[PDB]
Amino acid sequence: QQKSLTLIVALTTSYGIGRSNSLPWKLKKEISYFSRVTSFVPTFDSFESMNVVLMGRKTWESIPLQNRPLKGRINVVITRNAAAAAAAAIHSAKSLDHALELLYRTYGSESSVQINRIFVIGGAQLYKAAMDHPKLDRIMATIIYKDIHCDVFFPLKFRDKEWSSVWKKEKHSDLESWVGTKVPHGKINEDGFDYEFEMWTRDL
């Protein structure tokens, strides 16, 4: 493939991600961080360059009807059906690769709109397919320092010893460089607990 995928997730230290088909916490600076990262397209390329967000159907269903599609990003919803899709615009694909194929077909060299970065934004199930994909090389993880009760977990303990020779946490300086903006270094406290922004990579 051409472009690598980037995964972006918030999780607890016990790898909880979801509870109620929603996020187990209300963290405004986290969502903001999420918005900036998945939307940032280096300045010289902006009139035409858009980032892609690739999220599973349950995650699509979790976004408030008002906030979807996710603004300023090519939204693509992953589903093993074709189905009926509530899209006034809304791409649909049956796999991560089927989505990539649809994006490169649709947003080619002769396109008014061109793809910059592709983000996988959730679904535990879709986070599982991403973690197995060859082009995934980067996780933008928000670490939440509380064992908040979840019913949905991140599928791979990427920050644990067992996966430390594959997955590596990058200096905060390399995080800022990659995201192209300053990012809060160290713990943030919002709604009763600490969280922080990390960046991990695994060599292609």
Ligand SMILES: NC(=O)C1=CN([C@@H]2O[C@H](COP(=O)(O)OP(=O)(O)OC[C@H]3O[C@@H](n4cnc5c(N)ncnc54)[C@H](OP(=O)(O)O)[C@@H]3O)[C@@H](O)[C@H]2O)C=CC1
């Ligand atoms: N903390 C965080 O950063 C995030 C947390 N979340 C949370 O995660 C939960 C959602 O996770 P989960 O329930 O697994 O759902 P997903 O969002 O992964 O949606 C799963 C559905 O999407 C489709 N799908 C997912 N992966 C694939 C695949 N590889 N191929 C084909 N279709 C696929 C299938 O749709 P179909 O049934 O149509 O076949 C599947 O039924 C919620 O609790 C949500 O709030 C979500 C994003 C981020």
Ligand SMILES: COc1cc(Cc2cnc(N)nc2N)cc(OC)c1OC
């Ligand atoms: C934009 O708001 C939301 C974003 C997400 C995805 C998400 C949020 N934060 C991070 N770090 N990663 C993600 N993949 C998940 C959500 O709920 C499941 C949201 O609420 C509507």
